[PDB]
Swiss-Prot record, chains A, B:
GO terms for biological process: proteasomal protein catabolic process; protein unfolding. The chain holds residues 9 to 106 of 398 of the full protein. This is Proteasome-activating nucleotidase. GO terms for cellular component: cytoplasm; proteasome-activating nucleotidase complex. ATPase which is responsible for recognizing, binding, unfolding and translocation of substrate proteins into the archaeal 20S proteasome core particle. Is essential for opening the gate of the 20S proteasome via an interaction with its C-terminus, thereby allowing substrate entry and access to the site of proteolysis. Thus, the C-termini of the proteasomal ATPase function like a 'key in a lock' to induce gate opening and therefore regulate proteolysis. Belongs to the AAA ATPase family. The keyword Chaperone applies.
């Protein structure tokens, strides 16, 4: 009957369009993936320019609890300086070369 | 009549099914997107932390009553410095390393 078909036609149309727009949103996210991946590469490169020469000799004179480390530069000036996640406080002891 | 309605109705369902298939695959790329997004956040931090922007060390070798404090730096020279209102010169005395 005409009535039946007409109702089914409506329901499957809106359901088609629901899914279509979910497709488009997830398709452009494929581009967003590429962009973040590039940025994963990029930031890693900055880790390397840091570590690369020139490098300077220091010796940990002591560790301070104000969240700084006292380092005697071989150059001269003593300075209180920050640590990161790659450095452990297990590593650190008075007189540790750095 | 009922034939005309059945053809439009069929088409709509067939293209709904196409979308459902394509959805699942770009959802997978979404997963990769998330992972690479965490690393972009995490890496940024590790360069900032490794850089460790410093402070100089000095020792209050003399004190003035002009609100200036003459502080022998760990560089060598003696310098004339300005004291902060976090740390008063009521709390700085000769021999206090600063």
């Amino acid at each position: 009957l005409l009535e039946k078909l007409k109702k089914l036609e409506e329901d499957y149309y809106k359901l088609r369009e629901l899914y279509r727009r979910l497709e488009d949103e997830k398709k452009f996210i494929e581009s967003e993936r590429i962009r973040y991946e590039r940025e994963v590469r990029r930031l890693r490169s900055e880790v390397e320019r840091l570590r690369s020469p020139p490098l300077l000799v220091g010796v940990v004179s002591d560790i301070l609890e104000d969240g700084r480390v006292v380092v005697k530069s071989s150059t001269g000036p003593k300075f209180v300086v920050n640590t990161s996640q790659y450095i452990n406080e297990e590593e650190l002891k008075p007189g540790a070369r750095v």
